[PDB]
Amino acid sequence: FVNQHLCGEHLVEALYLVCGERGFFYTPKT
Amino acid sequence: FVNQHLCGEHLVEALYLVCGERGFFYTPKT
Amino acid sequence: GIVEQCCTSICSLYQLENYCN
Amino acid sequence: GIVEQCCTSICSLYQLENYCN
């Protein structure tokens, strides 16, 4: 079925989109 | 001969690639 | 963390937003 | 900032790496 999980690069794009001007911190750790 | 500017979503992918396991802060306003 | 809630499991809009600055 | 150094202007690998944690 379609996938609803946000992983790797997609998680970072989601944070970019959603956080907007607020920005965010990210660390690819496991 | 392609655009050499990193903007928006592309800026975030570059950071992801380049920073690797170090991680980063993405603060667009500053 | 975000990987656990969003990648391993599924997160809502607010769980995700809670990781913003 | 990163937007002006890299988006508005062009940045080198090191200027970009300077925004890593």
Side-chain angles (χ1 to χ4, degrees), chain B residues 18, chain D residues 5 13-21:
Chain B
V18 145
Chain D
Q5 291 215 296
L13 207 224
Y14 293 161
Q15 297 182 303
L16 229 197
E17 263 157 23
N18 211 37
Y19 295 105
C20 292
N21 206 80

Side-chain angles (χ1 to χ4, degrees), chain A residues 7-28:
Chain A
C7 302
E9 246 243 46
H10 290 315
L11 194 52
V12 185
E13 281 156 355
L15 274 175
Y16 172 72
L17 171 54
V18 149
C19 296
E21 50 122 24
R22 292 188 148 78
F24 58 103
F25 161 112
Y26 181 77
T27 294

Side-chain angles (χ1 to χ4, degrees), chain B residues 11-20 24-26, chain D residues 2 16 19-20:
Chain B
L11 195 51
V12 184
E13 281 152 1
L15 274 175
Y16 174 74
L17 165 56
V18 145
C19 297
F24 57 104
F25 224 93
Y26 178 65
Chain D
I2 188 156
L16 229 197
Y19 295 105
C20 292

Side-chain angles (χ1 to χ4, degrees), chain C residues 1-20:
Chain C
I2 188 164
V3 189
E4 291 86 337
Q5 308 196 302
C6 296
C7 177
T8 300
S9 184
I10 304 183
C11 52
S12 58
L13 205 223
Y14 289 163
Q15 294 188 305
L16 240 188
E17 297 191 328
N18 213 45
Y19 295 109
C20 300

